[PDB]
């Protein structure tokens, strides 16, 4: 059983810029944190970022062919975008949750509309890096009851 | 330290009809897995349900009375009516964490709009009675750090 | 107690604010006239009017224990604006009739809209009382073919 | 004293298609029992049906020159898209009941708009052919008090 | 033959409900009046109305094998739906003047939108019969300077 | 009882001068009262006061108005006024002529406090000035049942 | 003054860009053929035109004063963006006729709109100089009827 | 009898104007290529044109009745005002293939809009004749595999 | 000098017309009540009117440098078209509140936008000439000690 | 070289899932058919198929510098989000048929608009593999006679 | 003048509030930066200013008689709401820039929309005076190259 | 680097080869000229373009890395449609001013939004080549005052 985190656009950036503006933490320190949980749960997890939505795509494809059996996807920007992502998903049919560290609805109209949450199983937004966490154990309890 | 738990209109059917149909989870079911998890961690919780907007807006009131720290709140229906339940949880200024038993994307568009998550911490939707939980692992760890 | 006539907020006014307007007839003779209407055909018919929205919605639910078949509800104003009413009426699961005594078509642009109309077998607006008696006999036709 | 019943197009196919799906009933059967409800009140009623908008419209000018006092009508599709009825009906100053079989409020969004309702006395919809005679006994009362 | 006239669906009402409610003036009385205009000038001059948006069609089909010039057209009804008619004008390639009796502006909102208006040489709404003589003497000037 | 003129506040507005009076001021609900109270008896009329976060219970009220004889409804709605139909259509059933009054500015806030299920068919609006927008509506109120 | 011709802003160029655009024909030539029909008839009619929309309003309100039965207005782009217009026309209670020399409908989009169209007796536009001719001729029938 | 293809309004101008300026093929060419194409794969194709809503909506009743098994459709500007025309295709529930010669999305923005594009197989636009021919291929293809 | 009142176009017809049917109230009379009523508070109040959107920023412009601490505004139909007008009074930034003698929600659509209203101080509207007053008072209360 | 072919992103899991599914028939499959096709008429195609919008983009200019005629597009997801794809297309110049395997109509509303079909010569939606096949037959004819 | 540079309401008061707040930069430096460079390159340069949109029409009218070539124009406010203005530029057939100081897309929505732009040469917006420099550089370059 | 000269999709193709270009200009051109500019100033400037979105939002993060101290972007299409950018170029925080070669506001109407634009210091459209010029002549003044 294997579990897939894909993490969009400008998410390599957490924790780079003047580490008092936006907080200390780090892509790959919410990976490890990630990785650690799935460990002690005997699950096998990977993890993907990229800011190339083919990218992105072609990871999902390989996923079906890994048997992989939940992704949870923080899309970042092509949440609001990308008909492509939501296209791979339904495609290989490997359930999903998405997850956003930031509360999307206290921002711009813009950020209000996706085009993967209406197919998640759910979504998690706002509660920083906790949100993936809680996904991979949603996932975890789903995939071993 | 004191958390609140808001249950909305409609949610005391849970589990009630054709437990074959929506399941066989309750309301109470909920409460006291949320109870024993609070206690694990020595905080005091309380919950409330009610199907009266009224109801709910007092409760809210006099939570600011009590020294409630953080109100984990699902509105059900009134998410996407209640101005008054906004106004009422801005007006005593307690955070909130809004959660959803399913996912509110999957169904009409008129369930898509929100008078309330732009204003909430974060938002949780469509991990079933575990979304309730992950909010107060989020509140807990953010009370008591 | 089979068949249940719910009543929104403000429609005990009728009859009472100058019989110059809307006429002589009461929210009372409208019950009487169904009561003898469901009498006459063996059928147990109860009645229920409220201004607040919580009281109807625990009346829905309380239906649902007394194995009410069948809900003929005029929710006046609440039609427009309340997705509370909707969720207690498909959580029970109890099938209705929509009736308004008015033709709300011909009125403000924001009378056109109704969260229950879709989820109703049917729908009677403009014909006044009479509207009330002929979801009536719709009903007993259902019950007791 | 007379009644003019109009149906609009594509009503003719009722019950001719697999009458074990969409049910058995008849365009015939509906003026049957029209008719017979008129003669038990001494009304006299005429019925015309027609696929051809103009057909209606020259049907409507003729109960004008006929003395007719009310038209029940079920204009099927026209009632999303023909001004030409409306002015029609308008233009002859007949009063008219606007009436459908199905729940057009639960099917496709373009359906929930109408070119009659406003200016009708009042709506039935969704509750079969029993609508139309409703819509029949309320003009009987009308005409007749 | 040179110049045709149509008139569109209900306009064969005019003068016919109560001459004292919308005045004395029939279409008849139009088309007298514009007939005698043409002849002054030694313009050939049709006339066509009906209620079926076919024959109107068909008539503008016929208009462009009897070498006709202009078209003056009052669509009534058929001007907020007809793309038949604004396909059936532009297909002939014949220039065409809309002209209506009544001051379409001043009415409902849907009234305000035309299949034709943008096509047009010009409109005249709301001067009655005048905009018909007012359309002619235009036309006249155009073929004949 | 009658009162010639029913004052109604919605909901929330009982939380008026409770959190951090140094936040949105001092000024609670009753001081409004009060001073409205001590108004209308300046002119010898009647005035009753209401709150309440319940719809029904606003609802209800309106209702009982009719039945005491209120001549005129200054009412403060808050969120109601943009969600409460049933208001309209109480004040309209019972066809009691009223003012809407905010506190704050509501054009200045979020684009869903633009728009008002009673404002149409109020006589007017005061919206932005505070209490004092209370005391205006009064003082309209007083010239208009008194000339 | 018994009917007033109001001309909007940039009318005054007229004729003067190029011999071609949209012609020979000067603001001045319309006025002079406008005032020779009025003579023709033994009424008095004043001319307009301005650039400044306070102007025009002000003029507007001159003519109540001056007891102006009837206004002819081409407002030009003021019939697109000016209440102020609007306003005037309604405060001084003088009934008027737009006109446009072009058709406002062949044009872009926000030229579809007019604060004034809804309120004005009727409407000319697309037909030239004539247009304010007929208006002229309407307006002394209406007039010395 | 097989098939049966249907022409829309105004279709039966086509090669009728100065055939060198704006195409010489005629409505009988397109249908003359048709019935060869299906002749050579044994299939009987019947043809039809009118300007007639009512007249294509009895047409296709009539289908129903000659056990037409698919329709290949060019509703010309039907499509996107007709729902009596969908109704009538859904009321029979004859497959359907829409056809159009020109590129409908390459007009105005009223013509992205249909009433059938949703409920037929599928949709073949701005191909001229071929498309037709197209849709007939697929057509014997799927009734003789 | 210390307060300024402004009133847009049109407001100089007040009580011009038929006194009886918009009452015998004049612009002249509300000017002369409000200079009064500021004597009364040893407040200096000027007023100014126009019909001129340029004349009324010129007179806000002149506002600044004469020392005006407050501005009671009824910018009248420009409330709803001049972004001059706001962009005047947040570039000089002395506060205002608007004033209007009607209930503008009463009225057409187009009359519940305004480009002031969010700048304002607050707003008065359907309370006739006593807004004025109103208002005076409040900026009365403000401005001294 | 002559005729390029452009299948957009997930079009490469064509077949791959469950071929019980949405069927057997692959990306290969239909240009393998189309190759051959090409070569009954002694014309050069080319395929592409890419994930990744610069891919597709990078392959358009391409096409360009190798003489290629006309390209058959299917953009899959792209035609709805991509204005990149839209302006490599018209920048080259290289005229385009749009084909789609699915009848894109019949699905969620965001796929009813395209940022090429208006440019597009033509389009083919819903007729599977074949409209591929149609298109080509269609471009042949056109490159040669 | 060979270049005529027009400023829109309340540009004026730029440096004139608290030169701290918003910059001591004036309109009268603007000016004069602007008129050295065209003094360099032998380009006579007119400038203007008004509050009145009737004198700014009135300018552009002006402009044409004085063989203006190229109108360098910061319309403020007018931007938004002044067809005349348009219609004034398109009018004289002289071809304009448009300028603004700050960045309007940065602003308020209403803000965004322009009834110049699309009609402008170009548009500079947000880096400041300098913007108008830019605008003057590109049409001295155009006018002698 | 202290510039970064960012170049979107399908820009490449300026010039001689024509994106329908009557032009000469190159990119290569282009970015000759502003290296010449940036020289001049003793300022160095890199610049990038890419078909792929990936590639851009790459190098905008690298830019930061480099310190870049200001960015001049024709995001091309991507303007309209590319949220990641955006979030790349305030992820970083560089700013930045938007340049386009032609006016979009004379396009179609899609090309009227920006996902960029409110961010930008400044936005520079439909001035060519010189418009990146102007942009870099900003900068430089204010990199070094």
Chains 1, 2, 3, 4, 5, 7, 8, 9, 10, 11, 12 share one sequence.
Do not use: M
């Amino acid at each position: 059983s294997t579990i897939l985190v894909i993490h969009g656009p400008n998410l390599n950036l957490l924790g780079k810029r003047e580490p008092e503006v936006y907080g200390h933490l780090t892509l790959d320190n919410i990976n490890r944190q990630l990785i650690a949980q799935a460990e002690q749960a005997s699950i096998t997890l990977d993890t993907f970022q990229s800011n190339w939505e083919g990218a992105i795509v072609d990871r999902i494809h390989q996923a079906q062919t890994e048997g992989v059996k939940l992704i949870i996807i923080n899309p970042a920007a092509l949440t609001h975008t990308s008909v492509a992502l939501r296209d791979a998903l339904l495609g290989v049919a490997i359930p999903f949750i998405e997850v956003h560290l930031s509360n999307v609805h206290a921002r711009e109209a813009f950020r209000h509309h996706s085009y993967l949450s209406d197919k998640a199983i759910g979504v998690i937004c706002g509660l920083g890096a906790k949100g993936y966490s809680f996904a991979l154990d949603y996932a975890i309890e789903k995939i071993q009851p």
